[PDB]
Amino acid sequence: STQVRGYDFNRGVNYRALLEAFGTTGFQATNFGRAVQQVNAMIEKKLEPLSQDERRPLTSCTIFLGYTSNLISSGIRETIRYLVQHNMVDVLVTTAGGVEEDLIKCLAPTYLGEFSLRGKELRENGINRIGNLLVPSENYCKFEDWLMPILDQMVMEQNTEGVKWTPSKMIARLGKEINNPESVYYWAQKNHIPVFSPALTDGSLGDMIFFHSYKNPGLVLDIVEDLRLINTQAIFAKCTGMIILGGGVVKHHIANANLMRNGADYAVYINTAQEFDGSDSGARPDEAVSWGKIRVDAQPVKVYADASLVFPLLVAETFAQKMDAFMH
Amino acid sequence: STQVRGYDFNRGVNYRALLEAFGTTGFQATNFGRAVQQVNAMIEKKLEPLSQDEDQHADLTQSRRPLTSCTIFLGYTSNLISSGIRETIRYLVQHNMVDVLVTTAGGVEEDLIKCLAPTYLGEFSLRGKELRENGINRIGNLLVPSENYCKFEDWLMPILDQMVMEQNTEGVKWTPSKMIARLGKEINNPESVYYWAQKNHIPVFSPALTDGSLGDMIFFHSYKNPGLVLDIVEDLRLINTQAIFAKCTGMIILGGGVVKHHIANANLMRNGADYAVYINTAQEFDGSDSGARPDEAVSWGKIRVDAQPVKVYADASLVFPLLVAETFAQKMDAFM
Amino acid sequence: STQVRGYDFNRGVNYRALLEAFGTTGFQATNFGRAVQQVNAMIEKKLEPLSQDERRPLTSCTIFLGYTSNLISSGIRETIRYLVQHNMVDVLVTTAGGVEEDLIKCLAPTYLGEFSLRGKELRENGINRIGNLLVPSENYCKFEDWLMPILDQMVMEQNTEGVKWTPSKMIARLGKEINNPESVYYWAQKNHIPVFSPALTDGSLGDMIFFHSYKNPGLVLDIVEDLRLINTQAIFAKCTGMIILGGGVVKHHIANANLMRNGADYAVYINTAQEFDGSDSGARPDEAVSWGKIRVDAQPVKVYADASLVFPLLVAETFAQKMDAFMH
Amino acid sequence: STQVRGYDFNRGVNYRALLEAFGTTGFQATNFGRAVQQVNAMIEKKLEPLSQDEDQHADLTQSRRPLTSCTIFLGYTSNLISSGIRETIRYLVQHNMVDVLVTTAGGVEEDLIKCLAPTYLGEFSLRGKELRENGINRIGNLLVPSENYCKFEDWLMPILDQMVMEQNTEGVKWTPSKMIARLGKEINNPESVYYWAQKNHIPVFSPALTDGSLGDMIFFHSYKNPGLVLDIVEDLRLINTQAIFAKCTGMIILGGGVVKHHIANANLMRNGADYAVYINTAQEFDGSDSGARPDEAVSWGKIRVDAQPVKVYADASLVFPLLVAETFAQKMDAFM
Ligand SMILES: NC(=O)c1ccc[n+]([C@@H]2O[C@H](COP(=O)([O-])OP(=O)(O)OC[C@H]3O[C@@H](n4cnc5c(N)ncnc54)[C@H](O)[C@@H]3O)[C@@H](O)[C@H]2O)c1
Ligand SMILES: NC(=O)c1ccc[n+]([C@@H]2O[C@H](COP(=O)([O-])OP(=O)(O)OC[C@H]3O[C@@H](n4cnc5c(N)ncnc54)[C@H](O)[C@@H]3O)[C@@H](O)[C@H]2O)c1
Ligand SMILES: NC(=O)c1ccc[n+]([C@@H]2O[C@H](COP(=O)([O-])OP(=O)(O)OC[C@H]3O[C@@H](n4cnc5c(N)ncnc54)[C@H](O)[C@@H]3O)[C@@H](O)[C@H]2O)c1
Ligand SMILES: NC(=O)c1ccc[n+]([C@@H]2O[C@H](COP(=O)([O-])OP(=O)(O)OC[C@H]3O[C@@H](n4cnc5c(N)ncnc54)[C@H](O)[C@@H]3O)[C@@H](O)[C@H]2O)c1
């Protein structure tokens, strides 16, 4: 049985050892160390070779990465981009803001602010607040100018070439169009990583589709085909892992997909929600076990924390140390 | 300036005076009192008489529901339909007290499943392994037997068959709201929220309607009877036009997530809601939309700068029935 | 097994029935109904007559009421006053602010404000913020004028009459001095309900003792005797119940006292804390069971909510309906 | 204006660059970066040379500790001493990097008990009944065998005997801080926070020192050896004078409760702290002092209006070691 003991700074600042010490520090530091172990187990399983019996290359473990939209507003956008760039995860799930703001960041930046800035004076200057971040309205003007010709082409392809659009197919197209290596969705489509977002209309992309539909009516986004697509990613996996940042639709959609295989083998939740309100967001991993979304023999972990603090540290201690195994 | 003073139980127990005293008790009790005031302001504006032409509003919004002097959007996370708040919401919809509903997929399907089989009380700490081994699914401190979903399957599959047939031969272009209206008509049960919503021409928006058991069933059904399409674009047009052609709007939002953003973003299209009450347990510090204060929404234009929005930081299962008791339920004589 | 079902407003607004329906509404409404049941069980046990074998009158169950200081800033001060006035609880525990602000409210009121008011402009006008409440600085001036002559007498009594002051003895004296039926501590001392507050110096009372000690040095407040006094309240009880609003010292001090009898028989927590940070505040009742602070056979309840919303409703459904049993 | 940008792992893993990138990552990562800046400002001011007279400051504050150019108050809730943050705090005290400690009683006693027996890792969900039946006590996801407290009893009772004897025949008037200094000297172990605090003349305030196991032991001891008195009034004088006669003050407060208010209220006596960092998981909505934002303290005069205080909303077991790594631990050459 393992003793509580924190990092001793009389050793100097040995960063790897400082991070390794979270495991024996207690409370959420210990859960962070457990999450490192769960993700490294996902990775080790993924890198094992496939048996006989056992367009994206299939691996020995399929990793679903989910994140709420605000994390793409944050600099965790870079963290996610890196993982997608190097084919370290296999399926992305995010809400609509998490798609559009990645693209918009290729046209204009987001800025630091404070949570307490007052909306009246912000609105008067055309500045929109996302937590302690700030997005000028002009950013969305630029998005409009960029996106509208693409909506024109998608409608034409729908009506003259038989294309049946879904959120994931639109997201791949937008990633191809943005054509920018800073963009998560550019790498996702380049690497054949599907992106699911069933409420893709809930955001600025929706605004633009809405306005567009009055000059160029008839665009259809079907969510049924995308439900088949995400569920089959789980059903035909040798192994699955879930890494879920935040809650809401993203968290349920990944977990429910994995119910179709009688549960994920590995699971890490990082979120700030709590169970007491009965929310899905705040449900503990053990709630998911009752449904079959996480296997009974799994050892899932939740870290109760803002992912903007934890996720880059998690990546540093897991994926980033196995980078070579993921290249060329 | 208003003094802090709690209810004095030397008066005995008058529950109305007790709830009214929330306003001067402080902290979230005070915000509850402010929320009562904001909702009563919405209702008061809604009940003012109107004079507008019936044909152009139906053409612009593509809806059969008459305009009133204030359009009220009610949103709730799915789990509140698992709870007994389902009865609270059903009452409001039954009496045409709100005008637009927004909920995630679970908030649709579990209202229907409750007409087939009940949900039970449990505890948050019940272990998943033993529950799974007995076919019991946990929702917070509630429990749903798996057999409930089997009954749901049997009820729903013939309806999905008809929907595909209507799509392919009668030109129907399904969306979530149109499906939700049809499911409410089929369930044909006065305990159901969506039975009343469709009967009263109250639309229900749920853009991620595949994220739950209804999705499971659509998925399974599609391998027996392929082809169903659910378009979210037309439903975006429908919700936004409800805000655009409103004379006045109020937002009452229980919980966060999709529901909260979808209602607020629709109201951006009219440069902001006139009244807004949030009841949710989220906090701002994580940058989340769920946890964003009303004043964040003001920066975007989702809430008018001149509005007096209120957030109550609390579990809505505690607060929403009390809020309805002090607002809509006092005005039911006007609502008929 | 009990079905989920909310109050049906087609019945009209039947307030008692609306409150009774919280039990079957789920999430924290259900925990509220459970708390009503636990408190009513405390009360029923307290009102049972004492056996042969089995200055405050001893009853069949000793109820400890704890609350954080801010709840006395709130209007829950009236709720607590009522219970103390009618001898419905037996021991009070609160932090220092929870003593002084009760007294100050007899000299000048507290006002409603908002959480977002900015401290600079408040400080410039001599207005102090407590959450969404406001206390003018003048309130504390009035407190100073009222309190200083009492500190003079306590020192004199210490040095010439052998008095050994403790927090609970000072609180009883201050309640006698305030001589005002709106005050919690007036009723507490009148009804021989002891009040424990081991960090009594942490607040305005401390400020005043601090300043006083420079003109009239030597006042001693011993916390050891007060530890014996609260622990013996638990040790020699036939039965104990704990009703704890908020966390911190108050929650631990009551629970630790009841460890000395191998645990409380009944327990209700109402607080907004969560367990994930390892805090005592956020510890669930079942953590206390591991120490022996709550008996293994007890059925404790936590309601996760702001007590300013819940506690008056709890009192309405429990103590207030048994008022007759507590009088004359 | 500063752009949002996360650390780019195409650079490889440079942990310093990774922590520095917190500042531009947003949400609480940004507040962490601001907290690093505030603490480094405190340290920088502390290390400025001073010229003040040694005798009058010792007379006014009744302390042997020399004044520096900034007095840093470090507060932490008890559970952080249960955690491995105990080692973080011990390092700071060992090297005289902070000037005043404030903690609740558990934060005193468990530092001493850890020199006698360890605390172990467990899980939050372990059931109390089975733990109680095996003499294991739960602290969050940590576990303390009851035997740890038996060892504590045996170590402490002879010390309590000496304290009573010194009170009754050598005129000693015990207070919490004076007791804590004596316990640190007796534990005589370089792993102990309070061993280092007393050796370096860093006072420790804990006005409710009876609320925990030390209280249990004082209680039991008093029926064998009556008479110990612990006065909190003189300790109020001692902490307040540390603020009053400071040239500059900074507050670093982990958690809420007594600790947070006691430090901030001491700093009111000088019309406010110059620097302040809160790290805690509390929220404002419940009116709590724990959850009060720094700007509430500004309204009282506890934080100067010209200061730039920062709160990081997070479990300090995650954040405090990183904060120390980026601040105090980089400056240890100056601190010798
Ligand atoms: N919860 C269910 O019963 C259920 C059923 C089937 C599917 N799902 C799916 O789960 C997904 C996520 O659900 P969601 O985003 O709609 O909500 P959620 O349950 O994830 O809640 C989002 C946030 O809303 C707030 N909230 C939740 N419950 C609250 C309460 N009782 N009082 C106040 N505030 C509260 C909280 O801040 C919470 O983090 C949806 O797509 C849904 O279809 C859930
Ligand atoms: N930037 C934005 O936030 C943004 C922009 C456009 C649209 N939207 C829309 O808002 C709607 C709702 O968003 P949602 O459900 O995706 O997420 P959300 O922001 O509401 O968050 C849901 C829950 O996830 C958790 N969470 C959030 N941020 C976290 C963090 N940093 N660390 C840990 N946990 C965290 C919290 O418990 C929160 O209650 C969407 O449909 C989305 O498209 C958001
Ligand atoms: N916790 C223990 O191990 C322990 C041991 C013996 C006695 N006690 C007694 O319990 C009483 C109450 O403890 P308290 O008021 O000092 O603290 P607490 O544990 O009650 O915490 C108070 C608040 O501080 C904040 N906090 C706690 N842990 C945090 C963390 N890890 N990171 C950030 N913020 C955090 C939270 O908002 C919390 O509600 C004290 O009198 C103490 O002596 C506790
Ligand atoms: N008005 C004041 O708050 C005030 C005034 C003077 C002094 N002080 C001092 O502040 C110090 C710390 O206060 P504390 O530990 O007593 O309490 P606190 O206010 O810090 O609260 C401790 C915890 O109790 C819970 N809590 C608080 N308010 C709640 C509510 N309304 N509903 C439910 N739960 C709630 C929260 O989890 C909170 O973290 C004291 O020693 C006190 O004397 C406070």
Numbering used by the authors:
A (entry chain B), C (entry chain B): 28 to 81, 91 to 364
B (entry chain A), D (entry chain A): 28 to 363
Reproduce text from the manuscript describing this model:
Hypusination is a unique post-translational modification of the eukaryotic translation factor 5A (eIF5A) that is essential for overcoming ribosome stalling at polyproline sequence stretches. The initial step of hypusination, the formation of deoxyhypusine, is catalyzed by deoxyhypusine synthase (DHS), however, the molecular details of the DHS-mediated reaction remained elusive. DHS catalyzes the transfer of the 4-aminobutyl moiety from SPD to the modifiable lysine (Lys50) of eIF5A in a NAD-dependent manner. Recently, patient-derived variants of DHS and eIF5A have been linked to rare neurodevelopmental disorders.
We solved a high-resolution structure of DHSN173S in a complex with NAD and SPD. DHSN173S crystallized in the P3221 space group with one tightly associated dimer per asymmetric unit, related to an identical dimer by a twofold axis. The structure was refined at 1.7 Å resolution. Structural comparison between wild-type and mutant DHS showed only minor differences of individual monomers (RMSD 0.15 Å) and the whole tetramer (RMSD 2.2 Å). The only significant difference is found near the mutated site. Asn173 is located on the surface of the protein and stabilizes the neighboring ball-and-chain motif via polar interactions (with residues Val17, Lys19). The mutated serine residue in DHSN173S maintains the interaction with Asn164, but its side chain, having only one polar hydroxyl group, cannot form hydrogen bonds with the N-terminal part of the proximal protomer. Mapping the N173S mutation onto the structure of the eIF5A-DHS complex suggested that the DHSN173S variant would also disturb the positioning of eIF5A in the DHS active site. The calculated apparent KD values for SPD were 3.3 ± 0.3 (wt) and 27.0 ± 3.1 µM (N173S), respectively, indicating reduced binding.
